[PDB]
Amino acid sequence: PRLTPWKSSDEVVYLKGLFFPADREQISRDELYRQYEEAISLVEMYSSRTRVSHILQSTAHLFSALMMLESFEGLDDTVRLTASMTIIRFVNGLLDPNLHLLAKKIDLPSLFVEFRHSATHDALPSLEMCKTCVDRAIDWVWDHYWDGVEESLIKELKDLFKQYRRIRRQNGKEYWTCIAGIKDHADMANFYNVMIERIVSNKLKWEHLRALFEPMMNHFIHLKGWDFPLGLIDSMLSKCAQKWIRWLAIEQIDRYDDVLVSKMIDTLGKTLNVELLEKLQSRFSADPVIKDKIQAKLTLIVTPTLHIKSFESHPNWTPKPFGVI
Amino acid sequence: HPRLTPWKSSDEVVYLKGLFFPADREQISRDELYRQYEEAISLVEMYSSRTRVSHILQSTAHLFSALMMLESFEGGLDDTVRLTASMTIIRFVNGLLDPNQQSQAKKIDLPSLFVEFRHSATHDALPSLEMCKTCVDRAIDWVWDHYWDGVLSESLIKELKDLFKQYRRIRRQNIPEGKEYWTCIAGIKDHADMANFYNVMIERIVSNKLKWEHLRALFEPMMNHFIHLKGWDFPLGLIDSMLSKNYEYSQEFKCAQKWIRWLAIEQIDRYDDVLVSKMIDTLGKTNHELNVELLEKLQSRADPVIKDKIQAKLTLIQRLSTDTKSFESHPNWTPKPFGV
Amino acid sequence: SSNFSFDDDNTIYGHDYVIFGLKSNQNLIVKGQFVLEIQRGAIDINGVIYHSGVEPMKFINPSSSSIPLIQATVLNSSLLENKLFTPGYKSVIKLTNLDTHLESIGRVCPLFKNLFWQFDLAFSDYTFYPITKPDNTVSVIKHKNWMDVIKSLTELYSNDQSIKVIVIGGKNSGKSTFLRLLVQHMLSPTLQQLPINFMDLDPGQPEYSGTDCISLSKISEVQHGNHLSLTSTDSTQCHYVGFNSPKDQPTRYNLLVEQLVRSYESDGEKHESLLINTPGWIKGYGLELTRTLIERVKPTHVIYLNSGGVDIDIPKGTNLIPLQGSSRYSSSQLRLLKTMAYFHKIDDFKFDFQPLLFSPPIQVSYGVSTGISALTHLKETGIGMDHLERSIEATIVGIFKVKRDHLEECLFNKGQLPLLPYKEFIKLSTEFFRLALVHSIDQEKKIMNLYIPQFRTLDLTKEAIIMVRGNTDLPIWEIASNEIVKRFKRQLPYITFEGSSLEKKW
Amino acid sequence: SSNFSFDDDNTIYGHDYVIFGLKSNQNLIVKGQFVLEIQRGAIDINGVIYHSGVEPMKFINPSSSSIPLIQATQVLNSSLLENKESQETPGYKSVIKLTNLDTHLESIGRVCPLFKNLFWQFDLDQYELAFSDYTFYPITKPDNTVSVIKHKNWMDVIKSLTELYSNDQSIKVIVIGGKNSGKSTFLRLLVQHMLSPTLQQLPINFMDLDPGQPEYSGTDCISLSKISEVQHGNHLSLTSTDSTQCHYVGFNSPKDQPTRYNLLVEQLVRSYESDGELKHESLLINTPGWIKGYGLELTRTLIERVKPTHVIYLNSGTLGVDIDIKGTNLIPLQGSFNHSGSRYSSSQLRLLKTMAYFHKIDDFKFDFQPLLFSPPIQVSYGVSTGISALTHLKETGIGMDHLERSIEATIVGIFKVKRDHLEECFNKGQLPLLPYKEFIKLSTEFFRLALVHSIDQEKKIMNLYIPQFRTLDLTKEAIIMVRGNTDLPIWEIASNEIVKRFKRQLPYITFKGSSLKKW
């Protein structure tokens, strides 16, 4: 179980996008260098939290160093140093898990062998040569490291929810617990909304679908981190579904909190159809500064209030794996 | 024995001691000490351009461009700054160590830090900014103690005395044997290569102490023979020296000019314009009355082009004294070191 | 082939503690963590003999560290009142089981478990086990000189007044072993009892310091076990180097050191007489760090464990000793444990090692609002402001104390997290409060979620919250412990399953 | 200690020239410069048979280079040789003679007591009667003076190549070796073979891309020259050797202008693919010293860029993997062998080569009296049409004010530019200082390198010293100039006879230093 600086695995293939455009041409010759500087401050950033693969880290310098070798147009001594040192370090790093033989297996180009030697023991190699190197090496990493680079759970969640539908249907206890357990199974995934498609599935009638649906919606709300209650609507934006939203609108007013209000501002944008906002706008009623603010949003076709924290232990808290707040 | 110095006159390196290090290390502005550093480095690169420069100096001109590199920093990404300084630290040590055949010791006395610095930079984690910055000055100072502080700021008489004296007997001689006399005269003449020699002539005339003009007369076959032998070149540097000598001076005062007339009378015939000017300007250089007089003398001595210049300068020296071309060889050539 | 004196029948199997009567020609060797009164006699351990009168002492000898032998080797005027059926052999040692819940490390890491006293002749199972049959694990010994050199000072100690004292050693030098060897001798209440004053300046191999700290620590009692600084000896200030080693902030590190000997200077002269450790580094700059240190200290004495010395030569009087030194399994990895251990201590000698998720963690809000005001980055200060907030997360950050007026200072960017530029940060007086690990940070409320090992709730009026992210790493187990990958189905917020060419930390 | 048939060959001293009569076995090492005709018989030199008919040849073989043996081994083989006899013919083998070169190359010595006896002018009691002194003579009595013969493969492989030539086919050949490999002695060894009289005198195309240790190139030049006549000794770029062009690389080594270097070569390749194609002359090549790192890389790029015709390598290598087998040859390293004192440092022998260029009156006449005596070919400063600007080859960044100083006392290249081509876009002002960036872009043909003497700050004109030229008259093309990396030989600025003239403080020199740091 190795440790990864990039919290998602994912931001890696995103760090191949910036370093390499792929749609390399045709693009602005400074957009190369605006993307590179997010990726260079990330590898620095990615490097800062924890060690990063040497191969990866050197890319970060190599690209920046190349940035040195273009923006340039005077006294070149410093810029034969940045790129030389990076190349020299870069080669020095690649080699050292332990000489003519060693390069051949390693496959570092022979010239790549020379430059470290020449810069180290000789006149600074010319900037024009370095460009050959910095680029040449850069191709190298792409050549090697860069170029190369549930069902059961779902069913159980579904079962749990379905169990809930039966429990309500009969119309504290351990069975009460069964509902609580379900809530965690939906927090963990990003598919909590996926149920929402499911809840619609149970519904056969107005309110009565709500009546069984309704107790949960309030309860999910009552414990904190009830943004998902805002969150579900985000799923809702895809928008029978509409009926839920209005009740969501009716329910939201009931959830009369600034964050709850906040969802609506977030909520209003999700709802392109005039009616959803209007009911939204209508409910807001345009009296608060936020109420004033919302109209601006509506017009468009924003932070309401301070959010405060303290050294107080979270009151209700479940195991979260250094992720998902 | 000789070697090629990039800097002409081996003077500036002394200067560079001033440029790289200012005499005062605190009072002068950093913005201006940083201007100061810039001038020094540029010459060195130029010096590198002219010829290879001792690696101490090559690294001195890298070390000060890495001191401004580190100290001038405005914050942000120190990825770039470490590399520039780091190589500079690294390149430098290597040069000193490198002319090291065996047993690689610090007999050279390079400090402990510097070996440390390379390894961290060379293979280990890059050195931190404070680390480079602390080190270079440590590095910067070392050269100053090691190298920089340290770099700080006859046959002829006999020939003239024996090339002129021998003639004097010859002067006595005048109303094979003929061969020696020509040779002695020639010998002084070939002999008087020297820049020094013109000064010698003035001394010689004074030395006579008791000579009538005729004693000069013995000289004249000799003096012209010199004018004879080498030509017109001789009386130039002979008058371009008497005049400077005369100006310096302003019978010994008296005797020469009288010679000067003797010189004065006979060569205006053979004289070009450009040289008369070389006299007219040298004559004008003197504020002394003497030369004002020599000017009128040259003036009264046919040719209208010359007569305007002697006068044009003359009334100026009478009014400063009352003040109270491409792909052609050299017209007149006199070999010089690739100086001048 | 170290073996300990073995007693049977005379040996007593007693409940929750072990008591033995020891023949004079006997030695006792103990693994584990035990509290020890003595019943009758004098026991000299590692050249220190402790009388019957003295109060029981707590030992946390670890498997990796060399054991401190408990010699019967034996008459002390009383004073010490020794004290049960049989007089037996000359000395009567009393052993009591210690519940410190150390040895619970086994739960977190499989390899780590064996270090302490748990099981994994007829022997009852408690925290402490004596290895009668000679076995591979080491027994404490030192050259007499090594004992003597620390020993020699002590007589000076009895007389007035203060001796300032330095050591220098390689990281693997075993001086750290050297520096706790001393503290026992001067302390022992056969001697002047004034609290020896103590300074630790090596972050890399700190003692009396959870990782990446330098410490002045007034040592009053006798740490008889290879405490990792897990037990508390009162100290005025930890101080956060933020780096494993001096190099990361030479200016910060040197500027800090001088600000610690001051308090030391205040009590350097105040009967208690100063003690110090130096970075293991002797090669290169850290010698200039040792030599710069020597002059400021005006230390009375100094010690070096190896020869290679001349710079150290002037002007202080110096002592050259044997390499000594001492499974870890790797000494370098031990750092994580000293680092990890900080969190799992409810109180000294009591550590819960259930993974740190399952507790209710602490929120504070990253706003000009008091609880947390700002964060600042040591080392690289050019992390883009929109990447700082994600950098802090999944890291082992440390919270700080600054005064409010100073606190106002010049945060740079208020929205989200108000970054504090480093340059401003060094300048202000800072007082450290506690280590922290933050499970996650919420963008949405700006509230941030952090674990801290233990605290009094940090009440203050307008002392701005202080943060810093140094170089100290995170032990893997807390995120990925087999315990927290079976109760959390495998997925990696930050972690991955075990190969491409080529990518592995240089 | 090699030896050559002594004689005892009924020699007549003559006066100017010495005439040799050879029994079949005897063959001669000759030490020095000389020209030879052949009066009877068929002498063969280095595995090539030359008869009476053939026009004479000029030898500059030098102590540093190996000595080309002059075999008499070939029996008269064809009616092709004609013999002219006014002497003795007698029925004994072949009669041949050469007469003194009179190069005047000999006076290396005055500048350099190191260089004395590179060419033999009597450099101590005589041990032998019949001794005479001339520009040329044998080592009749063995000494460690280097003969030249190469493995029959080495001779054969090139000789193996030659046979193909008689038939219509044209071979574009390569060669690659490390300096001291013997490529320089080898590539000399081939063009002799091809140009040999039996073959039709197509002028063999020879390309030299080697700036450090060139052959048929001034120091830091690249040139492809049709060679119509054989250089029979190792003339160090000392022969008329008519060729299309020289290009000023500006460095000892390829990398000095890597972007500039590669670009320069290709264009060079187009006049070689303009005429290489003709096949009247098979293209030939010299390849730089580098065999690992870029030079191998330039080489592969070089190898692909032009068809090999044939590819040769002197030692087994990691190179062999890198470049495809494209069929290619492998011969042994065969590095030329001499004592360094005997065979002067490659960086040390360049100074002779750098030096020789200024001092050559004509291809076969050399004056070694220091340059200072001669007039300086004084030229304009500023936007004047004579010379227009200086663009620095590599150390482009410098103070504008300083740059004028830099030029003096250096070897700089005289370029040709036409019309406003020069005008493509500093201070006029002390100097134009046209930049490198602007320069790489402009087309440019290169004039012979120029010494700089006594550049005049006061008025634009700067004395210059330069080698032989027809008047450099161009209607609009200014002499754009370039200070690269090429050094200054010590002797010309300071030699023994120049110290004598003044003994004055060096304008740029100093006169024992020990200890304190060259890299």
Numbering used by the authors:
A (entry chain D): 5 to 77, 79 to 103, 112 to 162, 176 to 197, 211 to 278, 303 to 334, 338 to 367, 398 to 421
B (entry chain C): 4 to 107, 116 to 164, 177 to 198, 209 to 283, 299 to 349, 352 to 374, 405 to 420
C (entry chain B): 60 to 132, 134 to 143, 151 to 187, 203 to 351, 353 to 391, 394 to 411, 417 to 500, 502 to 589, ...
D (entry chain A): 60 to 147, 153 to 187, 198 to 399, 401 to 500, 503 to 588, 590 to 594, 596 to 598
The article reads:
A HEPN (higher eukaryote and prokaryote nucleotide binding) nuclease Las1 and a polynucleotide kinase Grc3 assemble into a tetramerase responsible for rRNA maturation. Las1 and Grc3 are highly conserved proteins and have recently been identified as core enzymes involved in processing and removing ITS2 spacer, which is a key step in the synthesis of 60S ribosomal subunit. Grc3 is a polynucleotide kinase responsible not only for Las1 nuclease activation, but also for nonspecific phosphorylation of the 5′-OH of the 26S pre-rRNA produced by Las1 cleavage, providing a signal for further processing by Rat1-Rai1 exonuclease.
To better understand the differences in the mechanisms of Grc3 activation of Las1 between different species, we also solved the cryo-EM and crystal structures of full-length CjLas1-Grc3 complex at 3.39 Å and 3.39 Å resolution, respectively. Structural superposition shows that the conformations of all Grc3 domains and Las1 HEPN domains are almost identical in the two complexes, while the conformations of Las1 CC domains are significantly different. Notably, compared with CjGrc3-bound CjLas1, ScGrc3-bound ScLas1 has a more compact catalytic pocket, which may explain why ScLas1 shows better ITS2 cleavage activity than CjLas1 in the presence of Grc3. In addition, His130 in the ScLas1-Grc3 complex active site and the analogous His130 in the CjLas1-Grc3 complex active site adopt two different conformations, which are similar to the conformations of His142 of CtGrc3-bound CtLas1 in two different active states. This observation may also provide a structural rationale for the activation of ScLas1 and CtLas1 by Grc3, as well as for the fairly weak activation of CjLas1 by CjGrc3.
